[PDB]
Design a protein around this ligand. Structure first.
Ligand SMILES: CC(=O)N[C@@H]1[C@@H](O)[C@H](O)[C@@H](CO)O[C@H]1O
Ligand SMILES: CC(=O)N[C@@H]1[C@@H](O)[C@H](O)[C@@H](CO)O[C@H]1O
Ligand SMILES: CC(=O)N[C@@H]1[C@@H](O)[C@H](O)[C@@H](CO)O[C@H]1O
Ligand SMILES: CC(=O)N[C@@H]1[C@@H](O)[C@H](O)[C@@H](CO)O[C@H]1O
Ligand SMILES: CC(=O)N[C@@H]1[C@@H](O)[C@H](O)[C@@H](CO)O[C@H]1O
Ligand SMILES: *[C@@H]1O[C@H](CO)[C@@H](O)[C@H](O)[C@H]1NC(C)=O
Ligand SMILES: *[C@@H]1O[C@H](CO)[C@@H](O)[C@H](O)[C@H]1NC(C)=O
Lengths: 50, 208, 49
């Protein structure tokens, strides 16, 4: 990303803060949310196997 | 004397990058197509805030003064340029009736259009472009300066070129950022029924 | 069947803090390390700002 020299935070669509500008070496950093999601358990019937 | 503001008097209301997006805001912006008082010495109200723009060839305008009375009675903000340095301070100055103590802040650093927004504590935004009567066009004024001073401003003056002034009003605006974080167009959402529509839809293109 | 029964979530390792390269410090050598100190009938009074 290429932000203008005064810009500190980045924003995406629904006000999702998407980037920041590091104030100690002038890098724009893309933020990924820490990974999460549903867990599913796939089973034959317990009458068949555990 | 007066002139049309057109599409000018727009700035970034926050230090935030946004791209290819039609961000809506309510803030102190210049109403589109409003009269702008025109000058070429006098004293003016600061209002809620000021848009100021000057077209120059010979660098006539050097700065501004702000406060309540602008002659000894209290700390009054000053900006002044002389040679290769810009000098900015807030002291209780015995300023002249017609120019051309106690510091809480001191700092030392037609063919040109220079543009400035002054607003409440205090902020300066600007732009410049070369030119060839304020021009029909658009760009947004980038922030230059934050002054944490808290000075109680209500009136202001120029230090000396055609130049124009208008006063900011708290209106809703739709601001179109490009791929590169830059505001490249805007809608004044209370200008006309089509602008009320572009802001209802959050869209710069309106279908039938 | 397939049953949805929990939510996964990677937790943080530690906490970063970021602010400007620290600069424009007040010259305390003008109050605590100066070459002279004032009286007790009229003191040096300084607006640090
Ligand atoms: C296909 C299969 O394994 N079926 C068995 C069934 O014969 C048995 O009677 C039951 C006991 O609960 O468990 C199940
Ligand atoms: C030529 C022109 O735009 N004139 C307008 C005038 O109609 C309006 O009443 C006034 C408001 O102060 O501002 C100026
Ligand atoms: C020239 C000027 O305005 N000086 C003021 C003084 O009038 C006021 O009494 C004092 C209060 O601390 O602050 C300073
Ligand atoms: C380049 C130049 O002339 N700079 C002067 C600076 O030396 C002086 O201290 C200041 C006083 O306000 O005015 C300006
Ligand atoms: C809290 C305070 O100092 N408020 C003052 C107000 O009384 C005065 O009438 C005004 C003048 O523009 O400036 C501000
Ligand atoms: C901060 O300090 C480093 C050296 O430690 C320097 O290389 C860097 O450019 C500085 N960044 C800013 C924005 O001051
Ligand atoms: C974006 O930035 C590049 C320079 O890196 C510039 O050439 C290009 O014209 C810019 N795009 C827009 C839409 O202004």
């Amino acid at each position: 990303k290429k932000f203008l020299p005064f810009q500190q935070f980045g924003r995406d669509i629904a006000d999702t803060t998407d980037a920041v500008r590091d104030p100690q070496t002038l890098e724009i950093l893309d933020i990924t949310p820490c990974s999460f999601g549903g867990v599913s358990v796939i089973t034959p019937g317990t009458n068949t196997s555990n | 004397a007066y002139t049309n503001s057109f599409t000018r008097g727009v700035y970034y209301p926050d230090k935030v990058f946004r791209s290819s997006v039609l961000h809506s805001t309510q803030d102190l912006f210049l109403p589109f197509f409003s009269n702008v008082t025109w000058f070429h010495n006098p004293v003016l109200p600061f209002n809620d805030g000021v848009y100021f723009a000057s077209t120059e060839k010979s660098n006539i305008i050097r700065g501004w003064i702000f406060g309540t009375t602008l002659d000894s009675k209290t700390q009054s903000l000053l900006i002044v340029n002389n040679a290769t340095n810009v000098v900015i301070k807030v002291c209780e100055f015995q300023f002249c009736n017609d120019p051309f103590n106690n510091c809480t802040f001191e700092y030392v650093s037609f063919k040109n259009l220079r543009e400035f927004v002054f607003k409440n504590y205090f902020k300066i935004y600007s732009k410049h472009t070369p030119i060839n009567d304020l021009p029909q066009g658009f760009s947004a004024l980038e922030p230059l300066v934050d002054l944490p001073i808290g000075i109680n401003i209500t009136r202001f003056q120029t230090l000396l070129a055609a130049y124009y002034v208008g006063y900011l009003q708290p209106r809703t605006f739709l601001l179109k950022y490009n791929e590169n974080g830059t505001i490249t167009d805007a809608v004044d959402c209370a200008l006309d029924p089509l602008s009320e529509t572009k802001c209802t839809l959050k869209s710069f293109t309106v279908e039938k | 069947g397939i049953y949805q029964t929990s939510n996964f979530r990677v937790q943080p390792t530690e906490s970063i803090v970021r602010f400007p390269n620290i600069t424009n410090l007040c010259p305390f050598g003008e109050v605590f390390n100066a070459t002279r100190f004032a009286s007790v009938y009229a003191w040096n009074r300084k607006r640090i700002s």
